[PDB]
Swiss-Prot record:
Highly expressed in adult heart, skeletal muscle, pancreas, spleen and ovary. Also detected in placenta, lung, liver, kidney, thymus, testis, small intestine and colon. The chain holds residues 14 to 110 of 953 of the full protein. It is found in: Cell membrane; Apical cell membrane; Basolateral cell membrane; Cytoplasm. Pattern recognition receptor (PRR) that detects bacterial peptidoglycan fragments and other danger signals and thus participates in both innate and adaptive immune responses. Specifically recognizes and binds gamma-D-glutamyl-meso-diaminopimelic acid (iE-DAP), a dipeptide present in peptidoglycan of Gram-negative bacteria. Preferentially binds iE-DAP in tripeptide-containing muropeptides (MurNAc-TriDAP or TriDAP). Ligand binding triggers oligomerization that facilitates the binding and subsequent activation of the proximal adapter receptor-interacting RIPK2. The LRR repeats recognize and bind gamma-D-glutamyl-meso-diaminopimelic acid (iE-DAP). Transmembrane segments: none annotated. It comes from Homo sapiens. Belongs to the NOD1-NOD2 family. This is Nucleotide-binding oligomerization domain-containing protein 1. Changing E40K: No effect on activation of NF-kappa-B. Abolishes interaction with RIPK2. Residues 2-92 form the CARD domain. Changing E43K: Abolishes activation of NF-kappa-B. Abolishes interaction with RIPK2.
Length: 97
């Protein structure tokens, strides 16, 4: 099309995303299960030497797939960020490092 807010949001926050995302597998598994990533895409991510590189790769792929996939990805991060956040207080109190 001509307008791509979700794609742009990811592009502008690249470094912030690469340093704040510390888990790539749930992301790739979700992209696969929702048919937005193919076996080859996942394979390409696996081939990256570091996790930060995997996040950069995932972001590249997502951005190129388009607005629908980038929107999906953003809602996926939101849901994942809410998924375990409420255990932080507890994990900290139980002296769990």
């Amino acid at each position: 099309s001509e307008s791509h807010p979700h794609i742009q949001l990811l592009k502008s926050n690249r470094e912030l995303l690469v340093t704040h995302i510390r888990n790539t597998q749930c992301l790739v598994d979700n992209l696969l299960k929702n048919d937005y990533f193919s076996a080859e895409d996942a394979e390409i991510v696996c081939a990256c030497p570091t996790q930060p590189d995997k996040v950069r790769k995932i972001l590249d792929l997502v951005q190129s797939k388009g607005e629908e996939v980038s929107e999906f990805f953003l809602y996926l991060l939101q849901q994942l960020a809410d998924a375990y956040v409420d255990l932080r207080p507890w994990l900290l109190e139980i002296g769990f490092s």
